[model samples]
Target: GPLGSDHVLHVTFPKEWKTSDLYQLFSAFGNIQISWIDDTSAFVSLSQPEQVKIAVNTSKYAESYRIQTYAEYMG
Candidate 1:
């Protein structure tokens, strides 16, 4: 079997933001699977880990869009 790259990213946006809108921003980084969508936070699966470098260092989102490590894991 093949193991998928486990790169993850956390995101927060304005209340009016949609999942589709979220995609438009990060899709360029690579493929992704969004787990949940909401006014406060959203979960998305980031594929092809290399692209995260491209994702964060861009200006697709202005001040409202917040991003971080999606899974901090058990600690």
Candidate 2:
């Protein structure tokens, strides 16, 4: 069913980063749902229904890259 929480944030992450990199940065916000890593993209989903809020970068790739996520109702 397409009915759930706005808990996951599909982060347009940096290619130069690893899963641990993002985890270390965002873990302070809440528990991390590790199913959140792919090659060029990643996300956070709750077993309960789990953009993710963050504790808190970049340039040149500004046209090609930036920090971003899906809409609030995307869940």
Scored by TM-score, the top model is 1
Over 4 Å off, model 2: 1-6, 36-38, 46-75
How high is the lDDT of residue 62 in model 2? 66
- Number of the top lDDT candidate: 1
Task: Report clash pairs, candidate 1.
Answer: none
Please provide, for model 1 over 1-75, each residue's C-alpha lDDT reduced to its tens digit, 9 standing for 90 to 100: 022365577888788887788889787656677776566687877766445544554424668764444552232
Each model's TM-score? 0.50, 0.40
Clashes of each: 0, 1
Cα lDDT of model 2 by residue, 24-66, tens digit: 8666555566554566678765422222333102322467654
Taken over the whole model, the C-alpha lDDT of each candidate is 0.64, 0.54
